[PDB]
Amino acid sequence: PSLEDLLFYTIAEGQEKIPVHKFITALKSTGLRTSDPRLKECMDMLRLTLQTTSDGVMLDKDLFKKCVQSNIVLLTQAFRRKFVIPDFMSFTSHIDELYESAKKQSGGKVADYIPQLAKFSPDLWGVSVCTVDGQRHSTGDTKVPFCLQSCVKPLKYAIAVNDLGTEYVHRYVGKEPSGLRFNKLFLNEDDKPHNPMVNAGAIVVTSLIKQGVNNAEKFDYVMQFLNKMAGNEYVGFSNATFQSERESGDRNFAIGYYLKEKKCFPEGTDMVGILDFYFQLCSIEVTCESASVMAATLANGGFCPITGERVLSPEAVRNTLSLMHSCGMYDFSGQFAFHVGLPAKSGVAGGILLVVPNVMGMMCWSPPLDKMGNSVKGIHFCHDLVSLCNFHNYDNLRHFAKKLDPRREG
Amino acid sequence: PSLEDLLFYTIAEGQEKIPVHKFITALKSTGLRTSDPRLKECMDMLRLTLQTTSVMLDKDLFKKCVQSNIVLLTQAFRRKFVIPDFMSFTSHIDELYESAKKQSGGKVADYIPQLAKFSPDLWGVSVCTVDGQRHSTGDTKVPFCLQSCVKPLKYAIAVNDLGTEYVHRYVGKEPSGLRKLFLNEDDKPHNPMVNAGAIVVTSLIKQGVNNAEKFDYVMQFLNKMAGNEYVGFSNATFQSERESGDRNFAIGYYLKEKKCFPEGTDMVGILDFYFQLCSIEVTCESASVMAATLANGGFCPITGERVLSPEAVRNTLSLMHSCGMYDFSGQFAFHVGLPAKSGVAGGILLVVPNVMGMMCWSPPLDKMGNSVKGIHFCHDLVSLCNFHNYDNLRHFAKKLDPRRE
Amino acid sequence: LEDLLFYTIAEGQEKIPVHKFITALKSTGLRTSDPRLKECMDMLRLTLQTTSDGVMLDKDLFKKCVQSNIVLLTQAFRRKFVIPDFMSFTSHIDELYESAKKQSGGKVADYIPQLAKFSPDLWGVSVCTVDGQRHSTGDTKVPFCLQSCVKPLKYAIAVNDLGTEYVHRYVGKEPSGLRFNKLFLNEDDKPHNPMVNAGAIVVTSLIKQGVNNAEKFDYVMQFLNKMAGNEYVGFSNATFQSERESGDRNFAIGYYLKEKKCFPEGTDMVGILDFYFQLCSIEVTCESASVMAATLANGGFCPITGERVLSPEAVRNTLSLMHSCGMYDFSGQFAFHVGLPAKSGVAGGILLVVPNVMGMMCWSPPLDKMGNSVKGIHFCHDLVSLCNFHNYDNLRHFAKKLDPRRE
Amino acid sequence: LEDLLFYTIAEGQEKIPVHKFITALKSTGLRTSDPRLKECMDMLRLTLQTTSDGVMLDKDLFKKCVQSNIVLLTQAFRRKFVIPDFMSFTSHIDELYESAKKQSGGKVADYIPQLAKFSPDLWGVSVCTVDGQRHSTGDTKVPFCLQSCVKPLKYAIAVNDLGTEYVHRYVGKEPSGLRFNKLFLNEDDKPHNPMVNAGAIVVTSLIKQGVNNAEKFDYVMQFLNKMAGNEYVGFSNATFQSERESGDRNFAIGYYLKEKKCFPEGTDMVGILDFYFQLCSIEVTCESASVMAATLANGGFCPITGERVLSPEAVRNTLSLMHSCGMYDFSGQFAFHVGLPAKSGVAGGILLVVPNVMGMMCWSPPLDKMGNSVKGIHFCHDLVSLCNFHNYDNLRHFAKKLDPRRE
């Protein structure tokens, strides 16, 4: 028998001429993007064939085999409904409803501390999905660049644990939420910052990455890493934000000096330069779409879902998801872990990097923040999502009442 | 095409007439115990048949026995259970057991002479999967008191009966942070897993009846969770708990002061109730079933009864994660990443959601009040298997995944 | 000496009329009922029988009366007392009184409907100087409970009997600070200081260990009597019952103190709570308490009797801790602006000491947000505005401030 | 009367030799270099130029010299000074000095090489009474940096120039409590009090706003000069450089203060830090600082010059906060046992005030666990053991305590 022919017979649906657009529509509905890096060979071959074939454009069983041979494994999984979310079309319908519902939540205040963060409209609201299989969906303003800000903190932590290991990184930074208040103290009882998700801790993590090269190269090292995570979709940098970050960052300077005082950095740190590096990393840009891929990498045990690259060690992914759970959302972390139960990280731009382990990554973005510094619409959507689907870290996969389970069906 | 006869062929392995012994040994190896409540009909029918003579079973006789329970027996035999190769897995649990056995550190709680009576050499581990597959090693049939292990169970009951929204009017939902205080910033105890919080939870259950009936209500509930296995009560522990519980009295009075209990609570009675609930007895085996119920979305795995609402199970697992192990909670959630609850008797109620429940018991506690061997075992377990809450199900590194075959 | 005083009081003319001597004596601030004046007054009473007539003293007859108490009478008349112009001073106290009277703010403790019984309009101020000069204005003879005002008194007793070193094994010596009066124990597992509930409860357990609560109470009461020069010291059983029937916080403290092994070996903690509640229910009037305060002002000698009541060690320690921990959450503010050893109580009492000058008791039931008598606190501020009494005022160069110790 | 004093000093009219008058004068505790004695000593210098074989003042010649300063000289000689047996008293200071000398424990601050340069054997004690009577023992003329001793002085200046109300908009008035300056700010987002680094830094930003750091420093120096009656005040640039090179903690505080908008509008925060570091690097000797302390003891009048230097408002506020916040983590213990307004510095200095009696400066580089001079702390304890100087001692009834104001 033949896998290619088996798929041909599936897609054929009654002829030996599967029209090209018909194959494309079938492929798109699996949630896969036509532009999937893992589908390049197949799409190149169809483009070629559309050039050489007599106008018409209907593949022979033989011609179809010619196109899909290269990528047959992945195409089969997609078509034979084997993906983590089999009925992806229905699911995106749900994401859209959740999107529209959160859209109505107009409260919140746009971060005003930079006239840059201030530049964005409060009406921007975007949601991007990327599953662990590379199935994609977006709604709203998902192609508008914005800064990660604190969303970057778990990513740089992952990089540090990836390169240095858990044991070394946690010599410098604790592993638990502060509890004590919001961001009040810099250090816990051991004279370390409480965890990697707090400013003090992020600043220390920053000082562990790529020690002994200049900030230009350090930045490149992190950016290349971020590129892998996003499957080479948009990752940029706002110098505007960077300038404003350093011009107004008195609190961070205070933290830096105190960290110096208490000998919190690795031997021979340049403590003013680390702050500069810190400010840069917070000024890196994403769109909803590219960040959702980053989240999906974390969802996928450190493999970028749309490229198949191993990006982070599973040790780094686990540690990062652990600390995103418990420390991810500033003062709301406890409440959030309790009600939503998802590893998530917020940013002052209005971003929420969200992971549903073994299912998907997401990025929600709406500039208006709540009292505690979390995107209003983002937080509303996170609640709704977990209301709707049995995704919450301590939900049951067998008994979950009136919840929908998107991994079931097909 | 015959559901029963199909399984008969499978068990038969050719030679017509599956011997009794051989069917029993095949059944036991799926991890099921012959005393499974869901296997009652089948085992009753085998007992009947084992009276009618003084041998083997026809495809007709086998069908006679297994017809009643064919669904469950098929799943077991067609290796469909959460852990397919359960025989291999128990081998691993045994290794983990022996390894933790060698950890002789720790101090037995001597604050009550009842707790001080126990030997530091006791060490037991019981497994119950969400499918009712069981395994034990060491001293798993020795009764001991839940103590603080009871806190999540009573909380589940409260949320089950009253709902999340009401219960959390009285008790917070997050870990405290500092070791010391009774109340958080909102004048509620920080969460249900702390003494102050447990005491308040206690005052929400079965309001408006006496302590005798309240206790019965909790017992009935505990019975469902354990699939009617051993649940007892140590009056000895209870007396010592009340005679020496100055701290708890202090908490009670402060809770009274700050008007923390529901309208017109008798706070000294609630303390009495509290002391009783901490003095309830389990064995490793029975408690592992309770844990398995929590693992199983509130359905008792060995009976199939709906015991707790999924809301109560989620909330309880959430708070066990983050507040379960006193001062070690943060470290534990980080390294082990399993909902767990410890008790001063040396108990550790452990849940791996969607896989199994466990109870580990060794009386010697570490500096922070957690069973030495229990804590060592929990670490080992997660070292070995991809069970940690944020492990990846697809890419995990030279970790074993017991759900795969 | 008697003759010298005779000539002084004489004012030349006839014989000194008896009422004239009485008016002169009263104006020195002394009360005719001074215990240290007993002999003199008895003799004048006798004489005003035994020679019934015009009722004027011979130089010889005056000598007959005053010989017994000539020392004290001389000091009073030769303007040698701590406040020489006492008549003028009381005029000032009256102005300060009236000014504080106009402060109508504050809420009366309702937590016992026994405490709730008092009118918010009650307001009294009593002065007793280190020399026994007295003055009162407003409702100074109305009995009220010390409540927390008793805490320094019992502490003094404990340090008096046991010494500083032993007592401070059980109780700390500094203000709490820690987000107000929330925790029971400091970092050493002791209550922060004797002025806090937790600390007072522990102090209570150090006094007269090994006798029953009836006798313990008597022991403290006899002590309190000496301090007040045997003026009114009473007990409100009503308050006591309400104190025990609603004191959940104190019970919480008791149990925690038990837990943490904070009491002396073999304490009955529930009995100590009972004792505690009793001591808080002891009654004073403004006048009698002002004498107690004056004893503290006077290095432990009761000013109106001359009895040695407390060791100087106990008086110093108590004044030290009244300075810094005396007024609950307001202690810091109070020490800064008023700079007086003071202790407040939920009845509306403020036991006030100006070391080396006088003791005072101010009472107005309405309390401010922090639990201090509104009018009491207002008066304390005014007093220190007016006179250079603040602990760190200068005795040489002060402002437009009046200095009542100067002529 | 000059003639009156001549007879007093005469011992027996025979013409009173020069050295004999000088010896008599020195014994009152006054130094011949007293600024208030300039006229007298100038006249004696003139007269001692005329003859060449001794001098032996006439009655009219003595009158010629002393007439200018007769008031002050009389008070000194007619034993009217605050301590009127000063010879005996200095004997006691010497004993206290020798006793504290034997306390060899403690660690010299090595955080700056300048502080590390000092010998642990240095130990000096200087007394200046509110009347200008002086005494010294040990290494009292060796310059050292005030460091934190400067904090109350700058605060006084700020309150002197701006008033209490304004200054306390920026800085709190109570001790930190939480522990030893772990937090920067209290609940109101102000540093807890002027004695903490955070608070001192803010106080620094209030003085002489709107001029450059050169002039600001000059302004403070001029003020310091007045306080010390123009005795030694200097500056260690070495210390200053080390202070700024290694003061990461202070920078941390600076940035946090900036963040929380704690400075007056349009402060240059990095410059205020620079100013701060300078002020901590100002040099004194035991002797000159003891005069500064005496000014605080004397309601803001420099005892050796009679100049009004600080308003009594500033002096009271400063003494208040020295009481309660003066000695870092030991403040509470110190206030309790010693009961004197005092301020320590990491150089080993302890600026000490006994209000209405005297100022002192003790210096020994070795610090205890909490950052206070070992010998300094030991001496303060001894001093209060010996004399009834403790803030809550009684002036009439004290123990086997000596009272140097009596005679």
Ligand SMILES: O=C1Cc2cccc(c2)OCC/C=C/CCOc2cccc(c2)CC(=O)Nc2nnc(s2)CCCCc2ccc(nn2)N1
């Ligand atoms: O352990 C010690 C000695 C010690 C040692 C090292 C460090 C220390 C203390 O610093 C403490 C750090 C302060 C945190 C305040 C949170 O900040 C807040 C602000 C506003 C409101 C609140 C908290 C909530 C609240 O009321 N919590 C309380 N819940 N129960 C209380 S209060 C009183 C019952 C008695 C239980 C109890 C508790 C403590 C101690 N003694 N007894 N003392």
Ligand SMILES: O=C1Cc2cccc(c2)OCC/C=C/CCOc2cccc(c2)CC(=O)Nc2nnc(s2)CCCCc2ccc(nn2)N1
């Ligand atoms: O916000 C305020 C006013 C306020 C408001 C609400 C409650 C308050 C006080 O009570 C404090 C409640 C907690 C005490 C934890 C005791 O338990 C501990 C014992 C030992 C160590 C530690 C904690 C950790 C630690 O100290 N880290 C740091 N130590 N110094 C730092 S960091 C650098 C200054 C941080 C910047 C800063 C400075 C001042 C304030 N806040 N932030 N003050």
